[PDB]
Amino acid sequence: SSISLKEIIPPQPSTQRNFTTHLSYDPTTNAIAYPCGKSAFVRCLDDGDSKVPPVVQFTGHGSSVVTTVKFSPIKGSQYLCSGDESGKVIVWGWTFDKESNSVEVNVKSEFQVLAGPISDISWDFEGRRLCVVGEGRDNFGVFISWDSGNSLGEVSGHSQRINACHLKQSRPMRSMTVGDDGSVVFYQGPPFKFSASDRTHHKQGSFVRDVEFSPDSGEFVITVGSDRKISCFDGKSGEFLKYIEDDQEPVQGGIFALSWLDSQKFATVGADATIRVWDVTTSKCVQKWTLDKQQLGNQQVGVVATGNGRIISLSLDGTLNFYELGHDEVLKTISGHNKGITALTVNPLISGSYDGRIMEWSSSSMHQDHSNLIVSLDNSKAQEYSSISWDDTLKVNGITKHEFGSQPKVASANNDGFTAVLTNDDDLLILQSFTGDIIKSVRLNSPGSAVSLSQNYVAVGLEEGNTIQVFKLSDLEVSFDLKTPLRAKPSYISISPSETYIAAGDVMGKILLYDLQSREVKTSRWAFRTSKINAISWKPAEEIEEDLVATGSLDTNIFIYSVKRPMKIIKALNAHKDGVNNLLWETPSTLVSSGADACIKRWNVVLE
Amino acid sequence: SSISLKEIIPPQPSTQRNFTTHLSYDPTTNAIAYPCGKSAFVRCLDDGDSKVPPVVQFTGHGSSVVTTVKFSPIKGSQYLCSGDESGKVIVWGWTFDKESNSVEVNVKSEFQVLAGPISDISWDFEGRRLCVVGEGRDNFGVFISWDSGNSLGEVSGHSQRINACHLKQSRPMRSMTVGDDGSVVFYQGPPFKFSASDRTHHKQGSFVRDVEFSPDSGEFVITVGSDRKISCFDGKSGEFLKYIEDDQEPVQGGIFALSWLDSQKFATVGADATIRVWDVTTSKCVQKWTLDKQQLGNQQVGVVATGNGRIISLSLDGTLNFYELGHDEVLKTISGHNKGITALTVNPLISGSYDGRIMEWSSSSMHQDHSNLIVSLDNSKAQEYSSISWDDTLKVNGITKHEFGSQPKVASANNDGFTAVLTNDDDLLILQSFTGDIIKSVRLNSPGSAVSLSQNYVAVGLEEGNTIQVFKLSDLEVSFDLKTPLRAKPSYISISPSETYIAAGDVMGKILLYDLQSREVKTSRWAFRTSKINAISWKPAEEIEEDLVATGSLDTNIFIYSVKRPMKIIKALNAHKDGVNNLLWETPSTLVSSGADACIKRWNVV
Ligand SMILES: [Zn+2]
Ligand SMILES: [Zn+2]
DSSP states (O other): OEEEEEEEEOOOOOOOTTOOOOOEEETTTTEEEEEETTEEEEEEOOOSOOSSOSEEEEOTTTTSOEEEEEEOSSTTOOEEEEEETTSEEEEEEEEESSSSSSEEEEEEEEEEOOSSOEEEEEEOTTSSEEEEEEOOSSOOEEEEETTTOOEEEEOOSOSSOEEEEEEOSSSSEEEEEEETTTEEEEEEETTBEEEEEEOSSSOTTOOEEEEEEOSTTOOEEEEEETTOOEEEEETTTOOEEEEOOBTTBOOOSOEEEEEESSSSEEEEEETTSEEEEEETTTTEEEEEEEOOTTSGGGOEEEEEEOSTTEEEEEETTSOEEEEETTOOSOOEEEOOOOSOEEEEETTTTEEEETTSOEEETTTTEEEOOOOSOEEEEEOOSTTOOEEEETTTEEEETTEEEEEOSSOEEEEEEOSSSEEEEEETTOEEEEEETTTOOEEEEEEOSSOEEEEEEOSSEEEEEETTTTEEEEEETTEEEEEEEOSSOOSSOEEEEEEOTTSSEEEEEETTSOEEEEETTTTEEEEOOSOOOSSOEEEEEEOOOOOOSOOEEEEEETTSOEEEEESSOTTOOEEETTOSTTOEEEEEEEETTEEEEEETTSOEEEEEEEOO | OOEEEEEEEOOOOOOOTTOOOOOEEETTTTEEEEEETTEEEEEEOOSSOOSSOSEEEEOTTTTSOEEEEEEOSSTTOOEEEEEETTSEEEEEEEEEEGGGTEEEEEEEEEEEOOSSOEEEEEEOTTSSEEEEEEOOSSOSEEEEETTTOOEEEEOOSOSSOEEEEEEOSSSSOEEEEEETTTEEEEEETTTBEEEEEEOSSSOTTOOEEEEEEOSTTOOEEEEEETTOOEEEEETTTOOEEEEOOBTTBOOOSOEEEEEESSSSEEEEEETTSEEEEEETTTTEEEEEEEOOTTOGGGOEEEEEEEETTEEEEEETTSOEEEEETTEEEEEEEEOOOSSOEEEEETTTTEEEETTSOEEETTTTEEEOOOOSOEEEEEOOSTTOOEEEETTTEEEETTEEEEEOSSOEEEEEEOSSSEEEEEETTSEEEEEETTTOOEEEEEEOSSOEEEEEEOSSEEEEEETTTSOEEEEETTEEEEEEEOSSOOSSOEEEEEEOTTSSEEEEEETTSOEEEEETTTTEEEEOOSOOOSSOEEEEEEOOOOOOSOOEEEEEETTSOEEEEESSOTTOOEEETTSSTTOEEEEEEEETTEEEEEETTSOEEEEEEO
């Protein structure tokens, strides 16, 4: 009996308005690396079948949000380096398929580089040296060895935050750090030492967002920023050569990033939702692609050349846009979440995060209608879905059908087109999911922290004494109390499909199984989790008797308990970093989970 | 043993830069009607199976391009009226027998109303009267009975082309005709007669492109045009009430169409690639939707309200855009061809048309990289396709990889990454499909009109003597003639998948089967078609012995011949109006066809 990972739908790259998201690409594995929340991801761009893991997730930064992730330049080393807001940089490696037939991530080294957040990281061409930058205390960056962390020079010439850096990928070695107040600094080394600064070519007060030496001999170094200027310097002497400008193509928005496709051409991306490919020698824009400027999410905040004329651009809305020099049309777009997933539905698969974003995976439709945490999703009506959010609205297919007088804390929908909601004013509301009309309501005796709606009942977890009250869906004046209460505030409740049982967990990790009809406890032997229970879902028959119940908690784990054998547990550890939020049976033999890491995972459940 | 229709992928609405495309929608059947080429289509919007046929195709306008198709208002009547460039209006009805999956189209009446082209048509609310408008020598429109064609009034007040009309959908009946030079005319009736003219509210020389009375009581009438003005008139008196303008929402482009959602709100769409919903009373833009203005193809040419807040906008690029009031994001998009299909690939399914448009059905990616007819498509390389066009280029995934010194007339690729091209200068070129490099060539002793490339041979139809010359791929210096020449110019050639036989048809309708090795005719029994042959494709095994051969002809038919029994034929008549252009077996039992009518059809072969 087991639960094995079947598929991982990674999140999109994290993004911030007015900030660049530095991406990374590896030719050998044809993968891109990027941060999202407290994790660093490596996504393979391949299709069909390959030897490369579809996804590699690194959670070693713990409680610190990851800022950047960079592949080592050494082919096949399978090493990477990432930094976080706490100012810590980590060198780690992965391995896939062996005795385990799974991915293994190992920290090779870690150093506390800066006080404040790290903004960018760069490897030397040997993959043994690192230029780490950001904004610490009286120190905005360093040059260190990848293994011991010893200093290999100094970052200087900056009185403000450094936004990007890059090391010439060849001898003689040179470096460039770029930052706020239009500051740019050239270095020679190792040991990397200040060579010259420049604050005349980029407007003062401007944000110089990115820098990169041309490939091969690195004869050129280019810097770009919010002042929409493209500065070209000599890759060895650091002298200013000229601005890259084409009178037939004015840059209309602040630039966020660049990336060379080869030794003569490079792409720039900015707030004007335009991707441009420039030729350094002629200074002409040989290619460009645009998106509707009227949509804030279309701003391009990151970009990376992926070999042979291919380019991947990152939109502010987290979407990855695929282009190819010589083809005037975008090849494809990949969208998704980059914020914790708080709501899930199955058949069809629909997800919602804490920023209000909803994903319709059947049609790859991404929505940004809601503006806050998605409380619940209902897909009981053919081709439609109803969502509730902390923005105080209920929307049907992205259209507001009800405005909440009180913020909905939690909610649960059955299969008949109804949804039970618990508000901040302690009211239990029953709404017609696809019309938005409140059909009936009752004021709870105390605040409610969890609700489960079955065909005929409404189970509510009361914060007063952590008790569970069960109402008749047909008459909210009629209810009964489960004899035994939980030991802490109810966190999640789930009435069995036949309504024979009611599983209920609390914020401590305790889960109790009740016999709905006798309102008595049937078993209290289900292992304590020492962590908040976030999801409970009953397994459907392919024997028809209810038994196995999947559960996820803040302890990142997935425990499938058994009514019949309370001591029998099939589990999958480390399902989601910072906790499994939703869990459902897409199939009698397959589970789908989602977590605070903004990932959605499918699992095969084998009873053997 | 038979061929039955399995699926129909209808074209997109026909479109023209600077012109509006008047769409029609029927609530009762949840379908939309629109023109494309010389056909009128009705596409059901239903996602889940219903009693309504997915597609209805009227081909009665014959050789004349269809310009507008309108549903009758009578719920369930199943009648429609369409007009064409020859100035002919036709009232027709369809019947659908789900079980047989058969659609019957009957012509109720046809009237030659204008000398010139028809631009718009409107039914009265009783579905018994018609306002037909356009650009004629003597008249620009008429008012007639749907059954007798007898006049029910007179169109007047216009000295220039009329672009559209509408009949107030209630008594007292009224009408509005709109046209060039910013002229607007209001009528009363029946008998519909001139009531008042207005060449003051729309700029002189501008094109008033659309007009529509509000639903129900029709208290209002609105006109829109290239001058960017939205003029609101009283539905009963015709008196100008006010310009519909929102200080917070300026119209930055010529308007092409409008459609009332209800009695208070309507939508306008135009050259500024923006769909706007207004409220006549407040005069405010209640909702807006935009597409990237930097792309010509996003200009909006048509629009129609489909009820309950739903709206469909038509892009200049033929794409249908689905929106819904109160939802700031596009629901979905439907793209495709609106020009005859000329190239076809299978597994995955890719199609190309004579405007150079290429569609990747597997991912629903519509391409406009080429600027002219697609001569051929090759999808032999994994996740990639090579296309050759009359724009003189060979592209790989939409990127030019070769520029021809002489225009490619026809081309044929095999499964090994090669393509044989016959140029306008009579050269046979062998190119690597995915690099664009020419690796070998030879000047033919005559112009070539057809090619077939197999693993080892190149079959070429020569226009001089109508002979077939078969070169050895590995050495263009080695070639042999098939003993018997064709009766006429070769039009399509296909070498057997084992290279045992060679099927060849000419522009007259004759197809001959040759034995490649002995270069002798194996059978000349296959029925003559009195119509040029455009396609030949051998059926693959699920005995292995080659036998069935699918063939498409200009006369619209599909004939599957037999090598074993030359007299037996499995046919599918009327597969594509104006001719089946391409045929391929995406499966041993499923034949895929493309036609001059821009449709793609899948057939099951019993
Ligand atoms: Zn939406
Ligand atoms: Zn394209």
